[PDB]
Amino acid sequence: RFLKVKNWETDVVLTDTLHLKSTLETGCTEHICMGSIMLPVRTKDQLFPLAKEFLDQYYSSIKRFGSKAHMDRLEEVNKEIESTSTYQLKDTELIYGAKHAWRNASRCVGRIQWSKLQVFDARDCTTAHGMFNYICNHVKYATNKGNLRSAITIFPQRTDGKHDFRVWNSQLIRYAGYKQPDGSTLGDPANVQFTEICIQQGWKAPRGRFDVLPLLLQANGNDPELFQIPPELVLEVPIRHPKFDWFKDLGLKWYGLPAVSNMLLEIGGLEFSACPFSGWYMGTEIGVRDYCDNSRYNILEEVAKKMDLDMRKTSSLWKDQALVEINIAVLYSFQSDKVTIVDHHSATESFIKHMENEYRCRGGCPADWVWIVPPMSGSITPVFHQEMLNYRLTPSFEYQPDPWNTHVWKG
């Protein structure tokens, strides 16, 4: 059963067979589309089919499907599951799985890069201090003095769900947020709740507008522990504008390394609850969302004010005009400091080339239009005009609840 997607700007039509390999559910039905909904322990009963499916995919990809090595590995995993109730991936399988979870991430526009992921095996880690060390090395490797390198660090898998490894931070590097008694917020409003937890755990907050949060790390189900990333490892970029000299005086900076640390990596039915991964920024993530969301730093006002635009009526498009300038400044600053960044024109064009290649070589590329189209200038990027099919493939990155809502405190 073939399915076609059309690019309405170029009339290129692509045919998707890969969706037939899709198992998990989308949230949609024949009668409702949940395409804009943000968020729509395993027993050995269901674990071996998940392992077998993954291992068939793995051995197919290495052109050894049905081989003796393939059949012996299936045997070995089968015996390990009934004996021990779980199983361990080989290093080769772990690397394959992590790369393919990125390849399958339908909301990620950066997937042309999926095969160049640096995978750090942290499954021998046992303590929060051990986690801190692995994360420091990840941050140093990925940052590479501004020449950013994609990487993932994979901590031990879930066992009984009572011994999880978790990074309580949503990203490895993020700025604190403080609610003031007068109702205003200092710093990043998105991080107020997590900041409060850190402070309660003993963090001494400097209470500034761009304070790097401490790492809050949980090993083996124990209470989490606070660690401060060495500041020499945290690369930051002061934001200035190439024509507007007053822009630097707004006091803005951002960190160079985007490293998401709250998602769950699923490979062959195994669940890796701590698996921070990092690449590099698309400019709009900072310039549109981080700076200009009303619920974030929300700087459209001051920027438009210092630009002296007509702010009395929205039909002057003063918001749109300040938005472009802020995003110019983000890109200019990162390029000037030689820190890797990509603009949304380049990134969406690369994605279209990636997508067509995946249709040719793989039979499809699952893609979430709602997330792939950039949050400014949508229709002047090529993905806007591109029809896309969204479906769930494994290996995958999944959401998981924030640990402070489920953790059982040891005290």
Ligand X SMILES: C[C@H](O)[C@H](O)[C@H]1CNc2nc(N)[nH]c(=O)c2N1
Instruction: Output 163 or 296, the one with its CB closest to ligand HEM.
Output: 296
CA dihedral 158, 92, 140, 349 (to 10 degrees): -100
> Does 170 engage in binding with ligand OS7 (CB under 6 A)?
yes
Rounded Cα distance between 384 and 391, Å, is 19
Please tell me whether residue 109 binds ligand HEM under the rule CB under 6 A.
yes
Q: Which stretch binds ligand HEM (CB under 6 A): 104-112, 123-131, 233-241, 312-320?
A: 104-112
Is 111 labeled as catalytic in the residue annotation?
yes
Kindly name the residue from 102, 108, 166, 198 that is annotated as catalytic: 108
| Encoded tokens for 277 | 């991964």
CA distance 377 to 370: 14
Among 97, 177, 189, 279, binds ligand OS7 (CB under 6 A): 279
Instruction: Kindly state the smallest distance separating residue 388's Cβ from ligand X, in Å.
Output: 7
Min. distance of Cβ 38 from ligand OS7 in angstroms?
A: 4
- From residue 10 to residue 29, the character string flagging contacts with Zn ion as x (rule: CB under 5 A) and all else as - is ------------------x-
Is 108 annotated as a binding-site member? Answer: yes
How buried is 115 (Cβ within 10 angstroms: 0-12 exposed, 13-18 middle, 19+ buried)? exposed
Provide DSSP, 280-314: -EEHHIIIIIIHHSTTTT--HHHHHHHHT---S-G
386 contacts ligand OS7 (rule: CB under 6 A): no
114 is in an annotated binding site: no
Binding partner of 288, given its own copies, ligand X, Zn ion, none, CB within 5-8 angstroms per partner class: its own copies
102 included as an active-site residue: no
State which residue, 2 or 409, has the beta carbon closest to its own copies: 2
Strand order across the 396-398 sheet = 270-272, 264-267, 396-398
Nearer to ligand HEM, 142 or 304 (CB): 142
Q: Which residues pair with 225 in a beta bridge?
A: 217
Whole-angstrom Cα distance, residue 395 to residue 251?
A: 42
Asked if residue 33 binds Zn ion (CB under 5 A), the reply is yes
Catalytically annotated residue among 73, 103, 111, 158: 111
User: In 3-state terms, what secondary structure has residue 211?
Assistant: coil
Tokens of 2: 């073939």
Q: How many angstroms separate the CA atoms of 368 and 387, rounded?
A: 10
Give me the residues paired with residue 19 across strands. Answer: none
Kindly state whether residue 189 participates in binding ligand OS7, applying the rule CB under 6 A: no
Residues 367-386 touching its own copies, rule: CB under 8 A, are: 368-370, 373-380, 384-386
Q: Are 84 and 100 in contact (CB under 8 A)?
A: no
- 370 binding Zn ion? (CB under 5 A): no
331 lines the binding site for ligand HEM (CB under 6 A): no
Distance of CA 42 to CAs 97, 268, 279, 356, Å?
Answer: 18, 12, 30, 36
Q: Which of 102, 254, 280, 318 is catalytic?
A: 280
Q: Given the rule CB under 6 A, which residues bind ligand OS7?
A: 38-39, 170, 258, 260, 277-279, 281-282, 285
Active centre residues (catalytic) = 108, 111, 280, 285
Detail the residues annotated as belonging to a binding site for heme b: 108, 399
